[PDB]
Design an enzyme around this catalytic site. Structure first.
Site, PDB file in Angstrom:
ATOM      1  CB  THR A   1      -0.949   0.039   1.214  1.00 12.68           C
ATOM      2  OG1 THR A   1      -1.651  -1.209   1.308  1.00 12.68           O
ATOM      3  CG2 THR A   1      -1.978   1.183   1.064  1.00 12.68           C
TER       4      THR A   1
HETATM    5 CL   LIG Z   1       4.051  -0.969  -0.263  1.00  8.05          CL
END
Ligand SMILES: [Cl-]
Ligand SMILES: [Cl-]
Ligand SMILES: [Cl-]
Ligand SMILES: [Cl-]
Ligand code: NA
Ligand code: NA
Lengths: 316, 304
Positions: free
Chosen positions: B1
């Site tokens: 992320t």
């Molecule tokens: Cl990442």
């Protein structure tokens, strides 16, 4: 959009919502009925929470998403006065949300219940800014489902005014269900049709409760009947998208475990809420809680949820 | 992320997040980086919001009970003590669950007082940040204290930045992942965060919107083969990449998002394009799967 909220004889609550979404929507557009906090919410009494609360929403999907209305309603219902709390939420957190200030009218509806304690006091309400909303409710002791087309009063303006009604109920193996079969404009033409599916959906939930079923299984049985009506924009009869195809959104939440299951952009499955409930169920036993599109169909088929491969699309 | 938050020279904020999601996930599993209120949040100051606030979160697939995390951090940051408020929120929620957040809040005093923080219960989190005034991006690897157990303790650090003149400046805070500490990959995480901040500032200095600046940051973070977002995303159960991304604009409150998106090089670019078209039936804000792919290509967004 259809929805239901259930409390069992212990105060365990569940909520679910299912929708076909906007007519002629772009493929893959997912709306409120799939989104955590937006389409439904269920939360048992606990530390802060003196009430068990369950909420399901309807109307304009984007309006419900931007205001996260289901959760907002559940939090407001922790206040002492439930009627006033819901009314203020609808007025201030929905119609007057800065998240919708560009909108010329805010269009939505909600069904709620909350309970607290060996007697169980259930308060149930519905509120909507749409012209009307069809509800049905039933307790296992009254044994006769009541259905009602709630309308805005004369002088009200759809998308600017709020209608709100409700009641109270004191409750073995009983419980209580409230359902809705759409909030929008209504026609007296198919008003008895909506009323009839709401009655049957209440009866299925009540029968599930009277057989010892969990609140989630009883709220799912309600939504299966609501979906199956050719007149509701959910499951069979869902609006067709821009490619003339079916793409369904649905979700469910358990008040006890706080577990959640949801499907988005699902085609080829008769009852989307059944996949949502199976995701929730299998997730109690890092399991998924939200599946979409092709993978949601494949997961549903692999778990033996009845499919319609002829209604399933998989474009390249 | 990967994620980023931005404030422009006027105090407008934006936030975005992008992820490849959980390794070996079932096809079509959509996580928090796509969900409104969960993966990111941006909200200018208003009648109840004294601070313009922007939040981007990072999870390790274990989503939280009764938790809409980015929005909940934004609401908690309306308290006076921002450090305590973020700490209480992380504790009352994660502590075990692994994850992290980057936040900023600004207020006008004309000068802009920007407070920025990052917090994680993972072993480590790489962040970068930059103001348009200083002109050198700063990168850092946040670690749990010696002796801490991931998921049983909370790391939280941050700073304060004063922007003024109201020229064409701003501030950006990015992160390239919260997760296990890699001594070997540390330099690469710091470098991409550096490039991401610089791209964000370049956009602001050209007069761009805060959402365009935060998108330019995430494009850079996505393109690094080391980040679980865009190129290099974890492969799902069938060996394919499926991406989640979203972006929020604090001034208009508008939102764009994609889930389970395959075949598009930069998912955050699709989310930003959904937001931009929404600014003009309400257009869709959230597309998934093949329909999201088709919409992206139909709007000239490069496929891979
Ligand atoms: Cl990442
Ligand atoms: Cl659309
Ligand atoms: Cl309907
Ligand atoms: Cl999975
Ligand atoms: Na139907
Ligand atoms: Na990457």
């Amino acid at each position: 959009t259809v929805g239901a909220v259930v409390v069992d004889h212990e105060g365990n609550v569940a909520a679910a919502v299912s929708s076909g979404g906007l007519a002629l929507k772009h493929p893959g557009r997912v709306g409120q009925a799939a989104l955590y906090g937006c389409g439904c919410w269920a939360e048992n009494t606990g530390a802060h929470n003196p009430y068990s609360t369950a909420v399901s929403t309807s109307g304009c999907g984007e309006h419900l998403v931007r205001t996260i209305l289901a959760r907002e309603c559940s939090h407001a219902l922790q206040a002492e006065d439930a009627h006033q709390a819901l009314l203020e939420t609808m007025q201030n957190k929905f119609i007057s949300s800065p998240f919708l200030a560009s909108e010329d009218g805010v269009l939505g509806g909600v069904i709620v219940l909350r309970s607290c304690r060996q007697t169980l006091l259930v308060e149930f309400l519905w509120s909507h800014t749409t012209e009307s909303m069809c509800v049905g409710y039933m307790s296992a002791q009254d044994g006769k489902a009541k259905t009602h087309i709630s309308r805005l009063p004369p002088g009200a303006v759809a998308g600017q005014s709020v209608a709100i009604e409700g009641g109270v109920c004191r409750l073995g193996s009983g419980g209580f269900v409230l359902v809705h079969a759409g909030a929008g404009y209504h026609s007296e033409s198919k008003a008895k049709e909506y009323k009839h599916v709401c009655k049957r959906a209440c009866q299925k939930a009540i029968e599930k409760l009277q057989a010892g079923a969990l609140a989630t299984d009883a709220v799912t049985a309600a939504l299966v009947e609501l979906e199956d009506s050719p007149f509701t924009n959910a499951g069979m009869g869902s609006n067709l998208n821009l490619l003339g195809e079916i793409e369904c959104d649905a979700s469910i939440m358990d008040g006890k475990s706080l577990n959640f299951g949801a499907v988005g952009a699902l085609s080829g499955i008769k009852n989307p809420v059944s996949v949502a409930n199976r995701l929730l169920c299998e997730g109690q036993k890092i399991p998924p809680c939200f599946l979409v599109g092709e993978g949601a169909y494949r997961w549903a088929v692999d778990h033996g949820i009845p499919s319609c491969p002829l209604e399933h699309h998989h474009h390249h």
